[PDB]
Specification:
The protein has 165 residues and is α/β, with parallel strands linked by helices. The chain is built from 6 helices and 7 strands; from the N terminus they run ββαβααββαβαβα. The chain has one domain.
């Protein structure tokens, strides 16, 4: 079970943690991946989660794309959690570095409402280029299910907690 989280709201929790290490410890029902529409898990959270699965996530993802085509920005799919979780919910937040509409971040977080409890990163943060303070705000204002946020960077975690309205 989840430990060491700071409660932000009734249903949103946050911890300064490596989401791969959190997933290996907790073995949650759902771990969220910060996916792109192609499910190409090259870097950021996706690269790290995929490497922890010994590339099994990428092999499964390539088969999913071959069958279904790319996801939509703001969309998601449920695939195996491999050795990390029961399921991985691959969610595509807008990538500001690709000029994608930041308004799609709320649609991306709405996918979390289909799961009672999730371990997740802040969508569109990191290499996706959005402001993580804004991502946390959209998360708290959109997700109604229990979301345990893992923030890798200690300095960012401190800034997120200290600026939380």
């Amino acid at each position: 079970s989840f430990s060491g989280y700071l409660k932000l709201t009734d249903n949103v929790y946050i911890k300064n943690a490596d989401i791969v290490e959190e997933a290996k410890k907790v073995k949650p029902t759902v771990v969220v991946n910060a996916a792109n529409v192609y499910l190409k898990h090259g870097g950021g959270v996706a690269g790290a989660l995929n490497k922890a699965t010994n590339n099994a996530m990428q092999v499964e993802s390539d088969d999913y794309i071959a069958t279904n085509g790319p996801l939509k920005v703001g969309g998601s799919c449920v695939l195996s959690g491999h050795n990390l979780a029961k399921h991985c919910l691959h969610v595509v937040g807008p990538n500001v570095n690709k000029g994608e509409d930041i308004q799609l971040l709320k649609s991306a977080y709405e996918n979390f409402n289909q799961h009672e409890v999730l371990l997740a990163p802040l969508l569109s943060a990191g290499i996706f280029g959005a402001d993580p303070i804004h991502s946390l705000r959209v998360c708290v204002d959109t997700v109604r299910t229990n979301v345990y946020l893992a923030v890798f960077d200690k300095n960012l975690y401190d800034k997120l907690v200290s600026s939380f309205l």
